[PDB]
């Protein structure tokens, strides 16, 4: 596919959070955003479409991958229409926004579509550790790509519609408020289905300014998604491990701001999980087989954290409880898109040194 | 080297903690231990000597590696003398114990010898990430091998000298007491050099038996080494981050016992460290360049944890503090030696898919 072949030769250009802010500083930048995105979106679409073809034919020929592939092909064709059009024509700029909304909505069902493909592979070829490693590698990259493409589309369509927040970015995101929002939603669900919910305790440590409420530049909807998913797991674990107790331990959150990290630790006393099992919570193949369908899930939550050079880590004490830490870059200049790229370095990934008794 | 070549074709036989207990249950088992070790020690020596030869010549020909290689060669020659001797002769059994003590003492300086080699490589060839990955891979395996060989020697020489503890194993190790022993030693040093020390707070969660003090089968000297090293770092961090404070936060320890894990979490409020840097604490190349020379160090502490299928993990909140968790197998049947083996799976280890702005 030569049109895929053309754009796949470029690599995506990852943007900083600071660079996103300067793209939405004014509605005059719409021409600049249009000329940027009409090249960059085909580059990002084509790079991931080329990686999808590295999948073995027995994966490539399943209906769910063909369906998703057909969406990317169409989305790419929609965009490369605008490659010769005139940015000084306000009809070109509005038809471009229209086309971006259509592309976003066309791809809305990708997550359950790919999940259905994982389910099929488990039953048509099995769930061995080597298959699992390839699924992890591919889906982490495919979903991060998808997050980055939605980010670009959201920043354009939200800003140039026709300002404190800048599209999906809040330059003064109050982290503790997003924590409380996510807790409140999870509590609402947990009270409904379990007739009980732990309370919340929040503390902040602003190391450099001990009195200042902690703010940052971030995408608050991503931070909400991660926190909501963590709260859901921590509340269900706390309730189910205390069936015979009257007091529910609270869920505790510490928000810390350092020179480089902004860290959010959540802590439960919900009984914990053995170290040998805990990483299964981030495995796409484990995660496929009440509160089940309310959030994005733990694998995707960690990708949201990684998208701007952060991370999401779990560590548990079996018999006691579990902690989760969201790590975010404290500086907007360090908050840069983490994007997959297709080359031969990725090409060879797709292609017994300890003793046993 | 054919004598190396012979034994390197066998793979080490990792033993369980339960299997160690049955080897020291009686002093009549000395013949059994002798016939076992006179085969097993050459197997373990030869396997790691073969791996040392996979090192490039520019590493192999440095004085420190030649020195260590000369010790293993001699130790191997000492042992394979006993291959034809009669186990029913009590003179053979005592000369064997004598030979094991000599071999142990001959190898006593291996850690600073190999550290000197790392220092030389950094200055004669540099510290790039690829060199670092090979150093990590090799030294983790070389040191775990060395720990396993010392374990076997200790179990023989301590038991068949001429019983609650079984050589270096305590079948009723009171974990909180070893925690306090290690804390007390670190406090003694910290008071001496810093004129101050945090206090200790310990709690236990015995999930299955809430009133029972937590005991396990383990090697208490290994557990002491890890705890001592962690306490040293946590105390120095707490004191140095509170130069201008009057109150020192305590160091907190939770000991939890689950169905599969026994976990020991230590917590400090010593200011923390950014996520991007924390793994350098386990890097041999970082770790080479007061309390400096009192413990075994963090890399080796984690290997002690891994030796019987455990782990040692750090997680920090920059601007606040740091936690460490030692994870141990709760069941003596799950506590099995983690041994490196030399084959082609290890042979190929010695032999750019994300975007940058
Ligand atoms: S399966 O039986 O092999 C299996 C493997 C791994 C995990 C599980 O089940 C779980 C699910 C969820 C949790 N869990 C908690 O108990 N607490 C959390 C938290 N807490 C945030 C503070 C976050 C989280 F993502 C998961 C959690 C444990 C075991 C079954
Ligand atoms: S260097 O400047 O690049 C660098 C990289 C990584 C780490 C450091 O310096 C340290 C050393 C030690 C610690 N540290 C703590 O502050 N607390 C601990 C603990 N606590 C146990 C509860 C354990 C530990 F192993 C190390 C600790 C932080 C930074 C410099
Ligand atoms: C549905 C989607 C998410 C999905 C489902 C299933 C898979 C499975 O993907 C595999 C499985 C095995 C191998 C090894 C292999 O055969 N290598 C080539 C050997 N010649 C490679 C890949 Cl990419 C991926 C993605
Ligand atoms: C002193 C000891 C601990 C020490 C010091 C230094 C080292 C460095 O070891 C290296 C460095 C680079 C490479 C890549 C390479 O060259 N591969 C082969 C390419 N033909 C492999 C190894 Cl094993 C190891 C151990």
Domain ranges of chain B: 2-162, 170-329
Q: Nearest CA of chain A to the CA of B314: how many Å?
A: 10
Dihedral sign from CA coordinates of A123, A125, A130, A133: negative
C-alpha triplet A157, A326, B205: angle, nearest 5°: 150
User: Do B272 and A260 count as a contact with CB atoms less than 8 A apart?
Assistant: no
Residue B24 and residue B33: Cα distance in Å, rounded?
9
Residues of A with a known catalytic role: 225, 229, 232-233
Helix axis angle for A30-53 and A90-106, nearest 10°, is 30
The CA B82 to ligand 1 mean position distance, Å, reads 53
Contact between residue A203 and residue A263 where contact means Cβ atoms under 8 Å apart: no
Residue B105 and residue B115: Cα distance in Å, rounded?
18
Q: What DSSP string describes A79-102?
A: HGGGGGS-TT-HHHHHHHHHHHHH
Is A224 strand, coil or helix? helix
| Mutation target vs B (from A9, A353, A356, A357; most B CBs, 10 A cutoff) | A353
Local structure of residue A202 (DSSP, 8 states): E
In chain B, where do the E strands start and end? Answer: 170-174, 200-206, 215-218, 251-257, 261-268, 311-317, 321-329
Residue A320 and residue A247: Cα distance in Å, rounded?
15
User: Do B341 and A354 count as a contact with CB atoms less than 8 A apart?
Assistant: yes
A245 touches chain B (CB under 8 A): no
- By DSSP bridging, strand A311-317 and strand B170-174 are unpaired
Say how many CA atoms lie within 13 Å of B105 toward its Cβ.
7
The pair of three-digit structure tokens given for residue A50, joined into one six-digit string:
């080329």
Which fold is adopted by the domain B2-162?
Butyryl-CoA Dehydrogenase, subunit A; domain 3 (1.20.140)
Q: Which of B341, B326, B308, B306 is nearest to B18 (CA)?
A: B308
Q: Which of B76, B103, B272 is nearest to A254 (CA)?
A: B272
Is B104 strand, coil or helix? helix
Residue B30 and residue B158: Cα distance in Å, rounded?
11
CA distances from B342 to B43, B309, B339 (A): 11, 19, 10
B180 is catalytic: no
Q: Decide yes or no: CATH 3.30.70.860 for domain A170-329.
A: no
CA distances from B157 to A204, B17, B140, B150, B162 (A): 54, 17, 26, 10, 10
Q: Which residues contact B225 (CB under 8 A, 6 or more apart)?
A: B295, B296, B300, B301, B304
Residue A265 and residue A314: Cα distance in Å, rounded?
10
Residue A89 and residue A53: Cα distance in Å, rounded?
37
* Residue B128, H or E segment: none
Q: Please report residues of A whose CB lies closer than 8 A to that of B355.
A: 11-14, 337-341
Q: B26-30 long-range contacts, Cβ below 8 Å, gap at least 24?
A: B27/B159, B27/B160, B30/B93, B30/B160
Q: Which of B206, B204, B201, B211 is nearest to B180 (CA)?
A: B201
Q: Which of A355, A165, A138 is nearest to B340 (CA)?
A: A355
Is B97 strand, coil or helix? helix
Q: Which residues contact A193 (CB under 8 A, 6 or more apart)?
A: A290, A291
Residue B313 and residue A150: Cα distance in Å, rounded?
35
Contact between residue B208 and residue B259 where contact means Cβ atoms under 8 Å apart: yes
- Hey, which of B273, B302, B303, B304 would you mutate to test ligand 2's pocket, going by the most ligand atoms within 8 Å of its Cβ? B273
The pair of three-digit structure tokens given for residue B86, joined into one six-digit string:
């009669």
B211 touches chain A (CB under 8 A): no
Q: Nearest CA of chain B to the CA of A196: how many Å?
A: 23
Contact between residue A231 and residue A300 where contact means Cβ atoms under 8 Å apart: no
CA-B234 nearest atom, ligand 2:
20
Residue A204 and residue A211: Cα distance in Å, rounded?
9
- Choose among B12, B315, B353: nearest Cβ to A340: B353
Helices (H), A9-128: 17-23, 30-53, 57-60, 63-79, 90-106, 110-124
User: Do B274 and A256 count as a contact with CB atoms less than 8 A apart?
Assistant: no
Cα end-to-end span (Å), chain A: 51
Contact between residue B158 and residue B167 where contact means Cβ atoms under 8 Å apart: yes
Cβ neighbour number for residue B246 with a 10 Å cutoff? 5
Q: What DSSP string describes B193-260?
A: HHS----EEEEEEESSSTTSPPEEEE-HHHHHHHHHHHHHHHHHHHHHTTTT-SSPPPEEEEEEE-SS
A317 touches chain B (CB under 8 A): yes
CA distances from A317 to A87, A324, B183 (A): 58, 12, 21
User: Do A353 and B341 count as a contact with CB atoms less than 8 A apart?
Assistant: yes
Rg (CA), chain B: 22
A221 touches chain B (CB under 8 A): no
Contact between residue B1 and residue B40 where contact means Cβ atoms under 8 Å apart: no
Residue A87 and residue B36: Cα distance in Å, rounded?
82
Domains B2-162 and B170-329 share a fold: no
């Amino acid at each position: 596919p030569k049109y895929i072949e053309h754009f796949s030769k470029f690599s995506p250009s990852p943007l900083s959070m600071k660079q996103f802010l300067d793209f939405g500083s004014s509605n005059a930048c719409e021409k600049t955003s249009f000329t940027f995105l009409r090249q960059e979106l085909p580059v990002r679409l084509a790079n991931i479409m080329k990686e999808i073809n590295l999948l073995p034919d027995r994966v490539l020929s399943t209906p769910s991958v063909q369906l998703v592939q057909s969406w990317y092909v169409q989305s790419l064709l929609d965009i490369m229409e605008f490659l010769d059009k005139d940015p000084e024509d306000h009809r070109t700029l509005s038809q471009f926004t229209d086309a971006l909304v259509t592309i976003r909505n066309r791809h809305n069902d990708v997550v359950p579509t790919m999940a259905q493909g994982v389910l099929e592979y488990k039953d048509t070829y099995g769930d061995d550790p080597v298959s699992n490693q390839n699924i992890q590698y591919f889906l982490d990259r495919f979903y991060l790509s998808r997050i980055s493409i939605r980010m670009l589309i959201n920043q354009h369509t939200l800003i140039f519609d026709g300002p404190k927040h800048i599209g999906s970015i809040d330059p003064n995101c109050n982290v503790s408020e997003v924590v409380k929002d996510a807790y409140d939603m999870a509590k609402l669900l947990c009270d409904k289905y379990y007739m009980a919910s732990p309370d919340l305790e929040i503390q902040e440590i602003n190391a450099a300014n001990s009195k200042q409420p902690i703010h940052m530049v971030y995408v608050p909807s991503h931070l909400y998604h991660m926190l909501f998913e963590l709260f859901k797991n921590a509340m269900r674990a706390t309730v189910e491990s205390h069936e015979s107790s009257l007091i529910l331990p609270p869920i505790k959150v510490m928000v810390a701001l350092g020179e480089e990290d902004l860290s959010i630790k959540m802590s439960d006393r919900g009984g914990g999980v053995p170290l040998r099992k805990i990483e299964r919570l981030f495995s796409y193949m484990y995660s496929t087989a009440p509160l089940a369908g309310f959030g994005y899930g733990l694998p995707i939550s960690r990708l949201y954290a990684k998208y701007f050079q952060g991370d999401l880590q779990l560590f548990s004490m079996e018999g006691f409880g579990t902690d989760a830490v969201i790590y975010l870059k404290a500086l907007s200049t360090d908050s840069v898109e983490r994007l997959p790229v297709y080359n031969k370095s990725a090409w060879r990934h797709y292609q017994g040194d300890w003793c046993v008794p």
